[PDB]
Design a protein around this ligand. Structure first.
Ligand SMILES: NC(=O)C1=CN([C@@H]2O[C@H](COP(=O)(O)OP(=O)(O)OC[C@H]3O[C@@H](n4cnc5c(N)ncnc54)[C@H](OP(=O)(O)O)[C@@H]3O)[C@@H](O)[C@H]2O)C=CC1
Ligand SMILES: O=C(O)Cc1nn(Cc2nc3cc(C(F)(F)F)ccc3s2)c(=O)c2ccccc12
Length: 315
């Protein structure tokens, strides 16, 4: 299907356009090319430093009458340096006014660990240690619930949360709006079977990020795992006359998981959403699921000892 039904009954387009690393100079035309290619969901974030330009694109396509606002599903996230309530309101406003929108369809806690407030996204002492803060995501959640009550955000969600962190949120006393999504890394080398089963059991959808392995991530060592070059994935793509990137995106669609490939190249943006005219067989899905390597593409070793570091839990 072309969407994943959320618990609120809102339909989240299953293929969205990722924007991390897209330069401010190139993201406006890339979002316009994606909307022309049928994309109706754009993943954004205050931390990506390009929301203003993404806003310019949406505003132009709505002004040109190519689509209405309700046809789109815009997602942004709250960076952990802004969990405190006063800072949360200021950050959300910066994200909403940069995007030039009346409301967001989905706002997510970006990472579960609160970081020191300030101008930097990664505050650090002199020895390179990333500075944390004690304000939790539960406190930040209350500020986010207010935005929903103010009609500025339709729904809330979390990102990079393990099941213990989602349980704390679902068990929060006085919880007013449940999370409708948990955005995490997911691809054939990190299949997330237990986390996806847990989220679906709670009525929480999952959005898979870095579906192509994030080849353009900072400091990627060329010898690390390459999903786009894996011959085993190329073989299955050839059986369907599709590319490896199209198989990597169709994989999530067949698990009822939203996926958000990133690209500032119009031909690839088109190629990445031409995944609705074929289906991976049951045997092909089992083979791809067997490629799991519990491999995450972008790690920060300085975050491993943090209190909310999310990767060492079972799921
Ligand atoms: N919540 C979180 O913590 C995180 C969320 N995300 C989100 O997920 C999105 C996607 O993940 P991301 O890490 O960016 O990496 P992706 O796995 O989407 O890969 C992006 C890279 O793949 C290239 N590419 C895209 N399509 C193709 C294709 N068909 N063939 C070959 N190369 C292709 C792009 O090149 P080019 O652009 O030049 O076309 C770019 O270099 C992010 O942009 C962001 O929105 C990502 C990480 C973390
Ligand atoms: O954030 C994006 O969307 C992409 C993203 N991912 N990563 C890897 C990260 N790993 C983390 C781990 C924690 C932790 F919670 F574990 F502490 C906290 C924060 C991070 S950022 C980055 O290093 C990064 C830097 C700038 C802009 C975007 C990103």
């Amino acid at each position: 299907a072309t969407f994943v039904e959320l618990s609120t009954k809102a339909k989240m387009p299953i293929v969205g356009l990722g924007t991390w690393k897209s330069p401010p100079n190139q993201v406006k035309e890339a979002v316009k090319a994606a909307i022309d290619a049928g994309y109706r969901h754009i993943d954004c974030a205050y931390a990506y430093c390009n929301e203003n330009e993404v806003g310019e694109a949406i505003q132009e396509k709505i002004k040109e009458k190519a689509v209405q606002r309700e046809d789109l599903f815009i997602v942004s996230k709250l960076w952990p340096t802004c969990f405190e309530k006063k800072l949360l309101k200021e950050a959300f406003q910066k994200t909403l006014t940069d995007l030039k929108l009346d409301y967001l369809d989905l706002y997510l806690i970006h990472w579960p660990q609160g970081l020191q407030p300030g101008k930097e996204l990664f505050p650090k002492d002199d020895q390179g240690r990333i500075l944390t803060s004690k304000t939790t995501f539960l406190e930040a959640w209350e500020g986010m619930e207010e935005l929903v009550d103010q009609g500025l955000v339709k729904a809330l969600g979390v990102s990079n949360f393990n099941h213990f962190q989602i349980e704390r949120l679902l068990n929060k006393p006085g919880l007013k709006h449940k999370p409708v999504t948990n955005q995490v890394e997911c691809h054939p080398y990190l299949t997330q079977e237990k986390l996806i089963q847990y989220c679906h059991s709670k009525g929480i959808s999952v959005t898979a990020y870095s579906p192509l392995g994030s080849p353009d991530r900072p400091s990627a060592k060329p010898e690390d795992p390459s999903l786009l070059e894996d011959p085993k994935i190329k073989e299955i793509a050839a059986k369907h006359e599709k590319t490896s990137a199209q198989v990597l995106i169709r994989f999530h669609i067949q698990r009822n998981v939203v996926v958000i490939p990133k690209s500032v190249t119009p031909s690839r943006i088109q190629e990445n959403i031409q995944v609705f005219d074929f289906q991976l067989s049951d045997e092909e899905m089992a083979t791809i699921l067997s490629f799991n390597r519990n491999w995450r593409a972008c790690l920060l070793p300085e975050t491993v000892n943090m209190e909310e570091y999310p990767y060492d839990a079972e799921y």
